[PDB]
């Protein structure tokens, strides 16, 4: 379990900047800026509690009943979806310092296609990702619907408590040595250029394609490039099945990010 262990350890430096609208005129500097170590395999929203705890004593409003506003993360004045692994959002945007800069924002109009944060069950969404992944792999979602309620719960809990053993045990109960399809998502940079993303249908029954073999579906996302998966370069002669079974994210999907060579 060497590779996966390395993926579970993936961690980024995150600079969280709290908009002034959240705080009271005069509050100190330290409250407005959080510095944290966030895993690649998790959701930003899983660290919101940590942000509330640090800025609650300076809120410029009563969060219990004052009014209804929406909260969401932003990168360079651009809404960021929290429903993607942190590592995936990173690859998507990327002495030399490597860090992710996030800005907390509030508003009345919730940005289009953005799911609100603090009406947002991260655990439910996540569980469904794995449901979908199970169906794509087996043609049915029975393997995950067979987990006891406890396992499903121990499963999400491993992400929060960061328990590798539990995650590996449950996530394993959802895999195939002979998948019908590959749960694959392809994206481009949100930073430079235009942004596109796709979920091509890639049958596996009786085949063993390499990225090259399916470059047709890969290059389609944006109509020589480099294939980035889990923050690293991937050889085009690599087997799709091995790449999936080894580098898939904590939500069950394999993500490929294309970057200009």
């Amino acid at each position: 379990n060497d590779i996966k262990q390395l993926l579970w350890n993936g961690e980024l430096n995150v600079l969280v900047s709290i908009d002034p609208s959240f705080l009271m005129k005069g509050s100190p500097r330290e409250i407005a800026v959080l510095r944290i170590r966030v895993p690649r395999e998790t959701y930003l929203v899983n660290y919101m509690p940590l942000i509330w705890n640090k800025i609650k004593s300076f809120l410029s409003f009563d969060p219990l009943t004052d009014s209804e506003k929406y909260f969401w993360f932003e990168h360079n004045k651009t809404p960021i979806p929290w429903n993607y692994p942190v590592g995936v959002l990173f690859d998507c945007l990327a002495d030399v310092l490597t860090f992710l800069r996030i800005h907390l924002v509030m508003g009345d109009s919730l940005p289009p296609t953005i799911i609100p944060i603090a009406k947002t069950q991260a655990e439910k969404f996540w569980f469904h990702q794995w449901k979908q992944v199970c169906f794509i792999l087996n043609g049915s979602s029975k393997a995950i619907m067979s987990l006891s309620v406890n396992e499903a719960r121990k499963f999400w809990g491993s992400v929060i408590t960061r328990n590798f053993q539990d995650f590996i045990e449950i996530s394993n109960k959802i895999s195939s040595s002979r998948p019908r399809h590959i749960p694959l998502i392809i994206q481009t940079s949100r930073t430079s250029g235009t942004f596109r993303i796709s979920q091509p249908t890639i049958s596996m029954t009786g085949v063993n394609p390499t990225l090259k073999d399916i470059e047709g579906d890969i290059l389609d996302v944006k109509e020589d490039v480099m294939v980035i998966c889990q923050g690293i370069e991937i050889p085009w002669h690599m087997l799709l099945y091995d790449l999936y079974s080894k580098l898939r994210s904590f939500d069950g999907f394999l993500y490929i990010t294309l970057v200009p060579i």
Binding site: D2, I3, L6, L7, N9, G10, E11, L12, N13, V14, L15, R35, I36, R37, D95, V96, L97, T98, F99, Q230, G231, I232, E233, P235, M238, D242, K246, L247
Partner: peptide, 25 residues
């Protein structure tokens, strides 16, 4: 066997490059 070694090595670098200056965070 060998592709795994390349995977294991690139990720190991990744973690280290991404952990650099983690003292500031």
């Amino acid at each position: 066997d060998s592709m795994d070694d390349l995977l294991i090595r690139r990720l190991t670098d990744r973690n280290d490059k991404e952990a650099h200056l983690n003292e500031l965070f």
